[PDB]
């Protein structure tokens, strides 16, 4: 069983630790979801009529 060959373990561990925790996490961080456009048709600070 090749899986049991403990000679070549680090050459599997290292690049996985690199691509799962650094590269892929970054390629995610670049993917952002902006909040939806919410044109507010009610916003008017008009003081009381002067009076």
């Amino acid at each position: 069983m090749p899986q049991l060959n403990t000679t070549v373990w680090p050459t599997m561990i290292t690049p996985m630790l690199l691509t799962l925790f650094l590269i892929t996490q970054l390629k995610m961080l670049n993917t952002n979801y902006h909040l939806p456009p919410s044109p507010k048709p009610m916003k008017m600070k008009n003081y009381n009529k002067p009076w």
Partner: protein, 54 residues
């Protein structure tokens, strides 16, 4: 924008308040004045008719 534009014309109209007050002033003045004129006219007419009546 237009709501502020509306508020512009409205305050622009504010001057009505004062002249109406003015209107009542000049009115009530002539009233009391003319009332006085007819008070004096009536009272002298009363004595005049009283004597010519008796």
């Amino acid at each position: 924008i237009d709501t502020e534009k509306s508020q512009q014309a409205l305050v622009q109209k504010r001057h009505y308040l004062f002249d109406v007050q003015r209107n009542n002033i000049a009115m009530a003045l002539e009233v009391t004045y003319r009332e006085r004129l007819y008070r004096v006219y009536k009272e002298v007419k009363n004595r005049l008719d009283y004597h010519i009546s008796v």
